[PDB]
Amino acid sequence: PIVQNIQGQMVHQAISPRTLNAWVKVVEEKAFSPEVIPMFSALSEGATPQDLNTMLNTVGGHQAAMQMLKETINEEAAEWDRVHPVHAGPIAPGQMREPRGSDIAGTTSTLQEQIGWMTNNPPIPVGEIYKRWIILGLNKIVRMYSPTSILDIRQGPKEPFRDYVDRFYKTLRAEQASQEVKNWMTETLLVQNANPDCKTILKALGPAATLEEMMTACQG
Amino acid sequence: PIVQNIQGQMVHQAISPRTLNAWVKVVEEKAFSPEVIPMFSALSEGATPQDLNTMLNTVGGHQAAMQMLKETINEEAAEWDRVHPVHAGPIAPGQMREPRGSDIAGTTSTLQEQIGWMTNNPPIPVGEIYKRWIILGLNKIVRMYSPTSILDIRQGPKEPFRDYVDRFYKTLRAEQASQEVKNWMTETLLVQNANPDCKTILKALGPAATLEEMMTACQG
Amino acid sequence: PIVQNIQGQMVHQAISPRTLNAWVKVVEEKAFSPEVIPMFSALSEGATPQDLNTMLNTVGGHQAAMQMLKETINEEAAEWDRVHPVHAGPIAPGQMREPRGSDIAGTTSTLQEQIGWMTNNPPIPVGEIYKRWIILGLNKIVRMYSPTSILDIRQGPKEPFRDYVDRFYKTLRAEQASQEVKNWMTETLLVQNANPDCKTILKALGPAATLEEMMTACQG
C-alpha cells in the first residue's frame, strides 16, 4: 500500500506477506461468504492497482468466479473509456496524462504511473475506482454463490425464530435488490414467512415491529 | 363545477343531477374497486369543495369508510395548518386572505370564498388539493377493502395463467407499496408464484420477461 | 375533448360522463371483440391524451390486456423519440418547442399544454398519434383474445357452411396478419376445408366462383 510517513512525504511500500497470507487464507477457509468483501476492503487500504491485481491473482481456485470478476472489470473499464474521452499529443511536464480505462485497470500501466496518478494535485483515486470495480465484481460473485433465494425462505415447525431470522438476514445480505426495496422486504416478509404461532404473536404486536421486541415476544 | 364559457368568464355552475346520480350508482353497484378512484376523479373536474362535499355526503352506507375518509381529510388539514402559518388582521381589498386548512377543506366557509380563491391572480386551486386529499382517503379505503394480500397469491393447478395474472394485477393495483417496490414485485413474484409447468416455461423464457411473451408462452 | 364554436375556434371541454359510462359498459358487456376498436375510435374523437388515459384507466378488470396496451404504448413512445432528434441553436420567433415521446402519452404534462399543442399554429395532433397507438394496442389485445389459428379451421360433417364461414371470417378479421395474404387465404383456405358433398358442389363452379353463389350452392 501507500503508508503516509509521520509528518513527512507518503512513501510507497510493498504489500505485506502477512496481508497476502491472511487474504489467501480467508479466501480458502470461507470460500465467498458475504463478509469477504468487507474483509477485502479492510485488508486492501490505499493500495495501488498493482497491489490489487496481486491480491486477486494470489487467489487459487474458483476460476469461474475469477473470470467473472475480470469480465466485470473489463465492462467497467469499457464504460469508463466510453463516457470519458482520452486526450493525446504532447503533454506539459509535471502533469500526468489522461488515465485510460486499461490503465486504471492496471493491465497496461506501471507502478510509476500509478503512484504518479495517486500523488498528483488534485489526486486521482485510481485505487479507489479499481477497488470499487473489484467490489462490484465480488458482489456479483457472492450473489452467484447464494444457495437459496430470499423469497423462498420458510421457517420450520421446530426451527426457532432466532435461526430463522439468522438465515433470513444472511440471505438478505446476499440479496442484490436496492436498499429502498431491501427495506420493504425485511419489513414484510420477515413476519409474513414465520411459523403461525409467532406469526400471530407479531400480528398482536402490530405495527412498528422491531427485531428486539419481536425476539423478546417469540421467546419460549 | 366551474365551466369556462366560450370567449367569456369562467361562470360557476351547480353540479348537474346526472353527475350525482352516476356517482351514487357506481358507489352502490361497484362497492369500492380500484377504478372507482379514476371514475371519481373523472366525474368531478374543476369542482368547488362544496361540490366534493356534496358528492361525498350523498354516499349511502359504508359509513366506516366515510369516517376514515373524514379522518384522513382532518389529518391533512392539520398538517397543512401546521406547516403553513395563517395571517390575520386587516386585509387589503381585492386580495383574499390566507386559506386555512379547515377552510381549504370547505367545512368553515361558503361558496364565495372558494370561487374567489379559484379565480384569484395568481390562482390558488383549492379543488386540486381537496380532491388530492379525497383521493388519498379513497386509496386508504380501497387498500383496506382488498380481501387478500399481494404476497399470498398462488396459482391453482387447473386455474389458467390468464386468471392468475388478472388476480395478481388487480391485487397489485390495490397494493400500497411505492412504485419501485411495485415494479420489483411485478417483475419477480409474477413468475415466482406461477404453476410449476409454466413456471419452468417462463424460466426457459429467461430475462427480459414481457407480459405478452409470457402469455404467448403459457398457451395451451 | 375540443369542440368547435360559432366563431369557428375550439377550446377544451370536460369529458361527458353517459361517454365514460358507454365505454365502460361496452368494454365489460362485449369484453374484447373486433368491434370494440371502431366503438373506441368513435367515442373519443378529438379527445386529449388525458381523456384517453382516463378511458384506459377506467377499464376495471382484464388488467393483463391493459398492461399489454401500456407496454405497446411504452415501446411506441420510445420509437418516436429515437426517430426525431430535437434541433439545436436559436429558435425562430414565431415558433416554440415540441413534446417528447413520453409527453405524447400525456403522462408528464398538464392539460393546458395538451390544449396548446392541439390548437397551436400549425396544430400538432398529439391526440391522433396517441389514438393510433391505442388502436394498435387494442389490435394486439384482440389478437391475443382470439380463441384459434387460421389454419386449424376444418368444417364438421354437420356444422353448416354458414357457421363455418362465419367462424372463418371472424378469426380472419381477428388475425390481421396482412391484407393481400388475407386475399390469398380467402381464395385457398375457404375452398380447401369444405364438407365433401358441398366441397365438390363448390368445385363444380371453379375458382372463379364468388361467395354469393358459393353459399347458395350449399344452400337448401
Add this chain to the structure above:
Amino acid sequence: PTSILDIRQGPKEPFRDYVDRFYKTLRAEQASQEVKNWMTETLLVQNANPDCKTILKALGPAATLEEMMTACQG
C-alpha cells in the same frame, strides 16, 4: 496433468466441477489470450453433458459465463 483438449464432463459430474477443472487447466495451459477467446467459445459448451449442452445452446453462442452457469444451476 492433462491437456485442455482432453477436458470432458462426466455423465453426472455437475457443471460446477466441470467448469472449475476446465478453467483451471486452461489457466495452467500456456497460450495467447487471443487464442483462448476462441478456445473457450469452442470447447466449453461442446464438452458438457448432453442435457446441459442443449441447455447452454438454448441460451446462445455468445452467452456469458454467469448466464451459462445459472442455466444448469442445480
Add this chain to the structure above:
Amino acid sequence: PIVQNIQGQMVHQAISPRTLNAWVKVVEEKAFSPEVIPMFSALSEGATPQDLNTMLNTVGGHQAAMQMLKETINEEAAEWDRVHPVHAGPIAPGQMREPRGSDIAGTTSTLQEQIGWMTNNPPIPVGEIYKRWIILGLNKIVRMYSPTSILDIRQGPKEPFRDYVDRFYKTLRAEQASQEVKNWMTETLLVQNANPDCKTILKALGPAATLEEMMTACQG
C-alpha cells in the same frame, strides 16, 4: 460483364452461355467445396450485378444455401446504407450517381444505371462490393457445409498419415478462424491426433518441424 473494347471504350457485353454452363456444371459436380469461391470469383470478373444475379439464380438445388446468401446480401446492404447515409453537406459541383443497398444488390437498379456507375469517372465499385458480399455469403455456406468439426479429426489405427493430413487440412481450410488461430492449431492439434506409431516419429523430429519433414518421416 463489361470489358475493355478496342479502343479504350468499355461497352456492355452480355454474359456468355458457356460461362453459365461452366458455373452450373461446377456447382453440380463439386457441390459447395472451399475452392468454388475462387472459381466463382474468376468466372465473374468485372460482372455487372445483373450477371451475378443470373449466376446465383441459375443454380439448381441447395435452395437453403441460396436463401442464406440472399439474407446475408440483404444484411450487408442494410449495414452499407447505415454506414453510408446522406449527411447534409454542400452539394458537389459534379454529380455522379450513387449506389443504394438495393442499387448495389441489383434489385431495383436497371442495367443502364449499373453501366453508368461502372464506366463513369470516377468509377463506383458496385461490382466489387456485390462480389465481396457474395463471397462472404459463400464463405458462410462452405463453413456450414462442413460435415465434422476440426476438433474431431483423428487418424485411424492403420490410416496412413497421407490421407490423415489431407483430410485434416481440408477440414481446416473449410473451417473459419483467424490466421493466428490456425497457426496455433496446426502446432497443437496436428501432431497430437496422429497415430501413436507415427506420433512418436513426429515427436522425435521436434515441435517446430515443418510439414515436409514430418511427411517424409512417416512416409511409408
Add this chain to the structure above:
Amino acid sequence: PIVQNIQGQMVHQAISPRTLNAWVKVVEEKAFSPEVIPMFSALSEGATPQDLNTMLNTVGGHQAAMQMLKETINEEAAEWDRVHPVHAGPIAPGQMREPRGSDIAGTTSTLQEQIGWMTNNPPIPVGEIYKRWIILGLNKIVRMYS
C-alpha cells in the same frame, strides 16, 4: 494474363474460364506428374500474381501439397526480404516503391501495384519471380510424390 494489343498498349485481361477449367482438369485427372509443371508454365504466361493465386486456390484436394507450396513461397519471400532492403518514406511520383517479398508474393497488395510493377521502365517482372517460386514448390511436390 497481360495480352499485348496489336500496335497498342499491353492491356490487362482477366484469366479466361477455359484456362482455369483446363488447369483444374489436369490437376484432377493427372495428379502430380513431372509434365504438369510444363503445362502449368504453359497455361500461365505473363500472368499477374493474382492470376497465379487464383490458379493455385482453385486446386481441389491434395491440401498437404498446397500447404508445402505455400511454405516454400513463404521461405522464398523471407529470403528475398532478407537479401533485399526495403525503402520507405515519401516516394517520388511516377515511380513505384520497392516491392516487398510478401508483396512480390501478391498476398499484401492489389492488382494495381502488380500491373504498375509489370509496366514500369525498366520493367520489374513480378510474374516471372512468383512463377519461379511456384515452380520450385511444384518441383518439391513432384519429388515428394515419386
